[PDB]
Amino acid sequence: RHPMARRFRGYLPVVVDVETGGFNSATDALLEIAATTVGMDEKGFLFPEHTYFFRIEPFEGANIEPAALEFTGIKLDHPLRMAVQEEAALTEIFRGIRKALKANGCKRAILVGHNSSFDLGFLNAAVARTGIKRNPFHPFSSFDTATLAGLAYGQTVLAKACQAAGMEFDNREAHSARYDTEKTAELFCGIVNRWKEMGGWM
Amino acid sequence: RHPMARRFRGYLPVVVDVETGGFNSATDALLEIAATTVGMDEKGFLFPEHTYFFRIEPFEGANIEPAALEFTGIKLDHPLRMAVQEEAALTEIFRGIRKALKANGCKRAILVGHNSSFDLGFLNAAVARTGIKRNPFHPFSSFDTATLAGLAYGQTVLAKACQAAGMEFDNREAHSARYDTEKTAELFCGIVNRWKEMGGWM
Ligand SMILES: [Mg+2]
Ligand SMILES: [Mg+2]
């Protein structure tokens, strides 16, 4: 078994963050999705490997809460938005994930996220809308970085967790799914790597 | 401050497990709830403290999947079931938790569970149905022991996580919430305590 396959019983951690048009996954638009795969180096340390990132054209009939959209800072009609259909974006991300599962001897991906059940619900709902087959993510379990940061740093807020971890993080409020996914992947790998450094995985 | 108040940013971990009439928190019955508060000893180690347990009468209009009843072994009409209205059970549990909060110098409870978002979703749906305003739990944050066990033991399945931890876990024929709560509490405390043993919280 590949070293990464042994670490989480055959699941490959893939960090995902979404931006949405509200908090209801059944009805609310998906507006951005980033996904960052994790690799394992020759010494058994995790690192963020590849990032996918797409801005998403709201699905037909989606609900968008005006205040929610306003707080994200997203500009739907901006000429450089480069928004794509959710099916196209998921197809490309999934393809990349399946390639990574094969390279790591893993059977399935597990979503890693900050308050990760939120992202997983939106991901499951988009998959259900598009009718995409062979979703490589576990449908129900996820690694919550708010839980990991609670343990490691006694913090549940993402910015405060990253600050505690010695990382840079901006209290600007205007961050794309890409920024959040890369910071979350760094937080995730740092905690797992500290656990190893402290004797937790020999 | 109180040392527990400093560990998780004023939140008191409280383990919750529910048994339910299916996987949909909007429609499916709450049938049992167990909650176990955690305390901190003089040496800074967490331990499982006070337990509450109630069998719940299905709310009027609730959906109960035949397969949920087979899985749990639940007999709704058994004369010694001693099931109570969800509003009464929650009120009693919440009162008990508030007492734990005060004794730990904490301001809110944070739900701990195995795939904790599941249990938080059912708790919030019951709180909504009953109109309880005095809910001491955080509405969206939780500590997921599937995440914690993935870190510590590479295991996401509760039974297997406990076995990796050196605990006994009975490969039972009827699933119980009192049993999962007791074991989840041990699992949670064991991992937080291991972090500390390894030099992670000084
Ligand atoms: Mg997010
Ligand atoms: Mg459970």
From Swiss-Prot, chains A, B:
| Residue sites binding Mg(2+) 1 per the record | 17
Q: InterPro entries per the record?
A: Exonuclease_RNaseT/DNA_pol3, RNase_T, RNaseH-like_sf, RNaseH_sf
Keywords, in A-Z order: Exonuclease, Hydrolase, Magnesium, Metal-binding, Nuclease, tRNA processing
Q: Per its Swiss-Prot or TrEMBL entry, what cofactor is needed? A: Mg(2+)
List the residues marked with site Important for substrate binding and specificity. Answer: 23, 71, 118, 140
Q: How is the cofactor bound?
A: Binds two Mg(2+) per subunit. The active form of the enzyme binds two Mg(2+) ions in its active site. The first Mg(2+) forms only one salt bridge with the protein.
A Pfam family this protein belongs to? RNase_T
GO MF term set: 3'-5' exonuclease activity; magnesium ion binding; nucleic acid binding; RNA exonuclease activity, producing 5'-phosphomonoesters
Gene Ontology biological process terms in this record: DNA replication proofreading; tRNA processing
Q: According to its UniProt record, which residues of this chain constitute the active site?
A: 175 (proton donor/acceptor)
Q: Which cysteines are joined by disulfide bonds?
A: none
* GO cellular-component term (any): cytosol
> What residue stretches are annotated with the Exonuclease domain?
14-188
- Remarks, anything else? Member of the DEDD group of RNAses that are characterized by the presence of four acidic residues in the active site. These residues are conserved even when the proteins have highly divergent sequences.
Q: Which HAMAP family match?
A: RNase_T
> Into which family does the record put it?
Belongs to the RNase T family.
Described purpose of this protein according to its UniProt entry? Trims short 3' overhangs of a variety of RNA species, leaving a one or two nucleotide 3' overhang. Responsible for the end-turnover of tRNA: specifically removes the terminal AMP residue from uncharged tRNA (tRNA-C-C-A). Also appears to be involved in tRNA biosynthesis.
What is the designated name of this protein? Ribonuclease T
Gene name per UniProt: rnt
